[PDB]
Design an enzyme around this catalytic site. Sequence first.
Site, PDB file in Angstrom:
ATOM      1  N   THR A 186       2.049  11.925   6.434  1.00  0.00           N
ATOM      2  CA  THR A 186       3.127  12.046   5.428  1.00  0.00           C
ATOM      3  C   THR A 186       2.638  12.622   4.134  1.00  0.00           C
ATOM      4  O   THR A 186       3.446  12.779   3.240  1.00  0.00           O
ATOM      5  CB  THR A 186       3.882  10.757   5.214  1.00  0.00           C
ATOM      6  OG1 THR A 186       3.037   9.823   4.498  1.00  0.00           O
ATOM      7  CG2 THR A 186       4.427  10.172   6.454  1.00  0.00           C
TER       8      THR A 186
ATOM      9  N   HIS B 279       2.859   3.276  -0.168  1.00  0.00           N
ATOM     10  CA  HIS B 279       3.759   4.104  -0.907  1.00  0.00           C
ATOM     11  C   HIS B 279       4.754   3.234  -1.613  1.00  0.00           C
ATOM     12  O   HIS B 279       5.157   2.200  -0.984  1.00  0.00           O
ATOM     13  CB  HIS B 279       4.493   5.145  -0.044  1.00  0.00           C
ATOM     14  CG  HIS B 279       3.579   5.908   0.840  1.00  0.00           C
ATOM     15  ND1 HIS B 279       3.127   7.143   0.493  1.00  0.00           N
ATOM     16  CD2 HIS B 279       2.960   5.625   1.998  1.00  0.00           C
ATOM     17  CE1 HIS B 279       2.292   7.608   1.437  1.00  0.00           C
ATOM     18  NE2 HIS B 279       2.193   6.698   2.339  1.00  0.00           N
TER      19      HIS B 279
ATOM     20  N   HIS C 207      -3.107   9.961  -5.470  1.00  0.00           N
ATOM     21  CA  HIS C 207      -1.844   9.949  -4.685  1.00  0.00           C
ATOM     22  C   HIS C 207      -1.445   8.551  -4.280  1.00  0.00           C
ATOM     23  O   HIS C 207      -0.227   8.279  -4.027  1.00  0.00           O
ATOM     24  CB  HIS C 207      -2.062  10.777  -3.439  1.00  0.00           C
ATOM     25  CG  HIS C 207      -2.564  12.137  -3.703  1.00  0.00           C
ATOM     26  ND1 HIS C 207      -3.705  12.658  -3.150  1.00  0.00           N
ATOM     27  CD2 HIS C 207      -2.017  13.116  -4.444  1.00  0.00           C
ATOM     28  CE1 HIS C 207      -3.872  13.899  -3.606  1.00  0.00           C
ATOM     29  NE2 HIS C 207      -2.809  14.230  -4.308  1.00  0.00           N
TER      30      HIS C 207
ATOM     31  N   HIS D 269       0.686   1.568   5.200  1.00  0.00           N
ATOM     32  CA  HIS D 269       0.257   2.355   6.272  1.00  0.00           C
ATOM     33  C   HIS D 269      -1.174   1.987   6.640  1.00  0.00           C
ATOM     34  O   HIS D 269      -2.079   2.183   5.814  1.00  0.00           O
ATOM     35  CB  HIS D 269       0.317   3.832   5.911  1.00  0.00           C
ATOM     36  CG  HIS D 269       1.691   4.327   5.907  1.00  0.00           C
ATOM     37  ND1 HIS D 269       2.036   5.506   5.260  1.00  0.00           N
ATOM     38  CD2 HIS D 269       2.815   3.806   6.410  1.00  0.00           C
ATOM     39  CE1 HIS D 269       3.327   5.668   5.349  1.00  0.00           C
ATOM     40  NE2 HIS D 269       3.829   4.658   6.060  1.00  0.00           N
TER      41      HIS D 269
ATOM     42  N   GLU E   4       8.800   5.159   2.929  1.00  0.00           N
ATOM     43  CA  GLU E   4       8.859   6.493   3.520  1.00  0.00           C
ATOM     44  C   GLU E   4       9.857   6.507   4.666  1.00  0.00           C
ATOM     45  O   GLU E   4      10.857   7.222   4.637  1.00  0.00           O
ATOM     46  CB  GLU E   4       7.452   6.968   3.914  1.00  0.00           C
ATOM     47  CG  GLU E   4       6.561   7.182   2.684  1.00  0.00           C
ATOM     48  CD  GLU E   4       5.474   8.123   2.921  1.00  0.00           C
ATOM     49  OE1 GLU E   4       4.727   7.975   3.895  1.00  0.00           O
ATOM     50  OE2 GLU E   4       5.326   9.006   2.040  1.00  0.00           O
TER      51      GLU E   4
ATOM     52  N   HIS F 143      -3.232   2.153   2.946  1.00  0.00           N
ATOM     53  CA  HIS F 143      -2.709   2.491   1.666  1.00  0.00           C
ATOM     54  C   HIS F 143      -1.236   2.200   1.656  1.00  0.00           C
ATOM     55  O   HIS F 143      -0.663   1.868   2.692  1.00  0.00           O
ATOM     56  CB  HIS F 143      -2.912   3.956   1.317  1.00  0.00           C
ATOM     57  CG  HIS F 143      -2.255   4.905   2.309  1.00  0.00           C
ATOM     58  ND1 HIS F 143      -2.838   5.304   3.457  1.00  0.00           N
ATOM     59  CD2 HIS F 143      -0.987   5.370   2.333  1.00  0.00           C
ATOM     60  CE1 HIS F 143      -1.972   6.039   4.133  1.00  0.00           C
ATOM     61  NE2 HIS F 143      -0.818   6.042   3.500  1.00  0.00           N
TER      62      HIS F 143
HETATM   63  O1  LIG Z   1      -5.787  12.369   2.403  1.00  0.00           O
HETATM   64  C1  LIG Z   1      -4.620  12.581   2.897  1.00  0.00           C
HETATM   65  O2  LIG Z   1      -3.630  12.428   2.188  1.00  0.00           O
HETATM   66  C2  LIG Z   1      -4.368  13.035   4.305  1.00  0.00           C
HETATM   67  C3  LIG Z   1      -4.247  11.778   5.101  1.00  0.00           C
HETATM   68  C4  LIG Z   1      -5.360  11.010   5.513  1.00  0.00           C
HETATM   69  C5  LIG Z   1      -5.240   9.874   6.251  1.00  0.00           C
HETATM   70  C6  LIG Z   1      -3.962   9.359   6.538  1.00  0.00           C
HETATM   71  C7  LIG Z   1      -2.815  10.089   6.163  1.00  0.00           C
HETATM   72  N1  LIG Z   1      -1.510   9.653   6.511  1.00  0.00           N
HETATM   73  O3  LIG Z   1      -0.524  10.314   6.365  1.00  0.00           O
HETATM   74  O4  LIG Z   1      -1.420   8.414   6.970  1.00  0.00           O
HETATM   75  C8  LIG Z   1      -2.986  11.268   5.416  1.00  0.00           C
HETATM   76 ZN   LIG Z   2       1.022   6.715   3.990  1.00  0.00          ZN
END
Ligand SMILES: O=C(O)Cc1cccc([N+](=O)[O-])c1
Ligand SMILES: [Zn+2]
EC number: 4.2.1.1
Length: 257
Positions: free
Chosen positions: A195, A93, A61, A116, A103, A91
């Site tokens: 999210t 997006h 993802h 994020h 986002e 991470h």
């Molecule tokens: O594994 C996952 O997608 C759930 C998850 C885990 C940690 C942070 C998240 N976020 O929306 O910032 C989401």
């Molecule tokens: Zn995120």
Amino acid sequence: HWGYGKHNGPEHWHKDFPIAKGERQSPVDIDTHTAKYDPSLKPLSVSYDQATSLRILNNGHAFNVEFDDSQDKAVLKGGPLDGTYRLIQFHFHWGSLDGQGSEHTVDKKKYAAELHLVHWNTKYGDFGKAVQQPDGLAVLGIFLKVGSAKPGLQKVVDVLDSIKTKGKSADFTNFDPRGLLPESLDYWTYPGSLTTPPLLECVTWIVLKEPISVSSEQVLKFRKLNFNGEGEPEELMVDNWRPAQPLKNRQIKASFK
Ligand SMILES: O=C(O)Cc1cccc([N+](=O)[O-])c1
Ligand SMILES: [Zn+2]
């Protein structure tokens, strides 16, 4: 299972995760003209001098840069928060093109990407317990625009080749997330959610106003990652963003005039 396609993307999530249509979902559009300055908000305290990165992971993802959160080493405090929140991972997006990827949006403007930094409230002891609480997480969101390179990101970019496909990880020690932060810590804040599924309504969002700049070359390397596992049909990891959700009965507060 859930993803970002036609058949399994955000518009489908509610069937497995009905909280998708909840009262405090993220992301949202930040309407700068209606976000009110709140003089009672504090400066944010971002204390990442002892952060201990361990690993980078392609989870199918996104990719996650993971930290040792077994002690109070990298913590977020102040701002809108009560108490102390420990960094567990960051991470991003991003888009297929520079005109989308974020986002959150700002007066409907989409940035090329959004970072994020995810933190959990130490009062709940572990992450899994914190996501069950309305004040369990604090996520620091930072927009990316394409322009000048971000030197502090390049260590991340250059490891991505080694985690092309879902389930790959790589040692990623000694990375300093301070290099990802903009000059100003001016922010917007509101209550919301994860999210990605399970979309839990456990987050105090802190979205910085000032984007960072990354180069086209940097973002291009994000778009070479794969959603798929080794030796499966290649589907590039792009457009892994959830669109803005209804604000409902929420106020977005600004830390700045
Ligand atoms: O594994 C996952 O997608 C759930 C998850 C885990 C940690 C942070 C998240 N976020 O929306 O910032 C989401
Ligand atoms: Zn995120």
